[PDB]
Design a protein around this ligand. Structure first.
Ligand SMILES: [Mg+2]
Lengths: 194, 224
């Protein structure tokens, strides 16, 4: 049935396109989960730094300061920077998005950015200014502590927001992933009926 | 008043802002569905015209002359030909060309030169339909009319009309090029509409998730 032969050829192709989109989804889920991880370490490093600044050590601050710097300038498999924007204390990269085609005509943004997350108006040298007044208190010392606490509070709001946003992306990925899965079994059915 | 419970106040205000974002996405999605259905109507009509044009070629491929009778066929071919030009040059209510890619004030098809030339480009526009998610919202005449060659169906139909007026030894060959060009365009037109139906479905998935989301939001906002 020369026409059934074609009907099949087309179902194979279509099938192959679905396998491709889900491959793009899995890959993108990996990267998202992978940022979620590093944001989780930013946040914990932030809470710890906030404890130090609240209960009161001098060594303890800069440990977390390096634990947050590392995370924002961290690199994947090959060696690209994740939170750099498209340029894969002064802010390293830009705020522009990387996109991925998860379905025909549907594209999804892949990255949170250091520029967006550290933009509180950097917590990183706001803490350099405070570890200073820690080493020898000045009459401004008190005001430094407060906008230190404020900078931690603001970055923490951005960090948490970013993690919320990643999650909404996982939900939306999963939506498309499941539609692909329903669609593929249909294709396996119809293929097998011919 | 707002000062009465201040951390609940902020909570409510952020649920309002999240509620307003969702209502905006769902408004983008309803609007995109509207624009997509609108393209489907024009494509549906392009496909009816391709059908009638093929039926005429099918009869008119004459083993048995009737050469003067073919003068009425010629007019009806030219009708479906023009009607297909009109559909690909459809405009919206603002006056934008639906099928021109990003050249929105330029007609997708132009015949000024003596032949049909595609002046639309094949760029996609996008619409944001959830945080960080875009859906492609246009089809293009330039992708749809491409059957290779660069050499679309409207030119081929004119080569057939010439062959209908003064047959040559190549009559049966233009006929066969004409059915092949029609079959190919039809596949593209139909592939487009299938692609639009898949867009509709994927929108509907996003919209459903936005609807759930709005539930949780109304509930948590209610109990407050
Ligand atoms: Mg305009």
């Amino acid at each position: 049935d020369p026409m059934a032969s074609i009907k099949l050829l087309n179902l194979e192709r279509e099938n192959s396109a679905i396998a491709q989109y889900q491959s793009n989804i899995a890959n993108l889920k990996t990267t998202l989960s992978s940022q979620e991880t590093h944001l989780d370490s930013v946040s914990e490093s932030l809470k710890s730094m906030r404890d130090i600044v609240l209960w009161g050590m001098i060594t303890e601050l800069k440990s977390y300061r390096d634990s947050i710097e590392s995370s924002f300038n961290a690199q994947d498999e090959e060696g690209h920077f994740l939170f750099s924007g498209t340029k894969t204390y002064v802010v390293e990269g830009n705020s522009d998005v990387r996109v991925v085609t998860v379905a025909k005509g549907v594209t999804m943004d892949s990255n949170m950015t250091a520029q967006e997350i550290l933009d509180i108006g950097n917590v990183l040298n706001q803490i350099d200014a405070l570890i200073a007044e820690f080493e020898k208190p000045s009459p401004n010392f008190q005001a430094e502590v407060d906008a230190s606490l404020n900078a931690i509070d603001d970055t923490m709001a951005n960090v948490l927001g970013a993690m919320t946003e990643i999650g909404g992306r996982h939900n939306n990925l999963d939506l498309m992933d499941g539609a692909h899965s329903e669609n593929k079994l249909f294709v396996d059915k119809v293929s097998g009926d011919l």
